[PDB]
Motif scaffolding. Sequence first.
Motif, PDB file in Angstrom:
ATOM      1  N   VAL A   9      31.143  32.310  37.372  1.00  0.00           N
ATOM      2  CA  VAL A   9      30.209  32.873  36.402  1.00  0.00           C
ATOM      3  C   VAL A   9      30.939  33.248  35.115  1.00  0.00           C
ATOM      4  N   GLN A  10      32.119  33.840  35.258  1.00  0.00           N
ATOM      5  CA  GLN A  10      32.903  34.240  34.095  1.00  0.00           C
ATOM      6  C   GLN A  10      33.126  33.045  33.170  1.00  0.00           C
ATOM      7  N   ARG A  11      32.987  31.844  33.723  1.00  0.00           N
ATOM      8  CA  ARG A  11      33.179  30.621  32.949  1.00  0.00           C
ATOM      9  C   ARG A  11      32.002  30.370  32.016  1.00  0.00           C
ATOM     10  N   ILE A  12      30.791  30.664  32.480  1.00  0.00           N
ATOM     11  CA  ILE A  12      29.610  30.440  31.657  1.00  0.00           C
ATOM     12  C   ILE A  12      29.392  31.577  30.655  1.00  0.00           C
ATOM     13  N   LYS A  13      29.838  32.781  30.993  1.00  0.00           N
ATOM     14  CA  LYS A  13      29.652  33.920  30.093  1.00  0.00           C
ATOM     15  C   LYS A  13      30.221  33.633  28.702  1.00  0.00           C
ATOM     16  N   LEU A  19      28.731  27.333  22.973  1.00  0.00           N
ATOM     17  CA  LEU A  19      27.566  26.526  22.611  1.00  0.00           C
ATOM     18  C   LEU A  19      26.427  27.421  22.132  1.00  0.00           C
ATOM     19  N   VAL A  20      25.940  27.155  20.924  1.00  0.00           N
ATOM     20  CA  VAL A  20      24.851  27.942  20.354  1.00  0.00           C
ATOM     21  C   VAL A  20      23.499  27.446  20.875  1.00  0.00           C
ATOM     22  N   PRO A  21      22.724  28.295  21.510  1.00  0.00           N
ATOM     23  CA  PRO A  21      21.390  27.906  22.050  1.00  0.00           C
ATOM     24  C   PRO A  21      20.593  27.058  21.059  1.00  0.00           C
TER      25      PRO A  21
END
Length: 25
Positions: A9-13, A19-21
């Motif tokens: 999860v720390q990877r996606i945080k 990456l900008v939504p």
Amino acid sequence: IGKEFKRIVQRIKDFLRNLVPRTES
């Protein structure tokens, strides 16, 4: 308690910061 699944999860945080939504803050 033990850090295991949280690691992935720390990877996606920080990921969201890389990456900008789709035009959204």
